[PDB]
């Protein structure tokens with residue numbers, strides 16, 4: 235656990251010094267009240283001028299003991315309508331799979347910015363949920379209408 239905790243302390247220090255505006259990333263607490271660097275509560279703001287604008291989308295970031303060998307599991311809570319988000323809330327993204335594009339050097343900031351980019355540009359070769367994928371393919375106007383409604387629902 236020393237390797238993960240040392241890296242996670244480095245990430246926290248960097249994040250607090252400089253992070254993208256409107257984003258949140260904060261470790262949680264253990265039952266005894268001490269800091270739990272393995273479980274972070276995060277939020278991603280929708281990009282201005284997009285259907286996601288005005289929404290603030292809460293996500294949990296869960297680190298395994300072998301981090302940064304492995305990527306964190308990133309899970310929208312509550313789950314979101316998006317073609318590449320599983321119904322569970324888990325994000326499907328190549329940088330978040332050890333055997334795909336994860337690299338140990340990737341930072342929490344890079345992950346959250348990567349997920350923000352995913353929100354506004356789905357990967358249609360990578361569908362994780364049937365409904366959002368089907369609507370994206372069949373009617374982009376309806377898709378955006380649904381995204382706008384969701385953004386309003388999660389206005390901060």
Ligand SMILES: S=c1[nH]c2cc(Cl)ccc2o1
Nearest residue numbers: 275276277292293294311
């Ligand atoms: S408040 C509050 N709860 C929460 C949960 C997650 Cl996963 C992320 C951000 C949050 O803010």
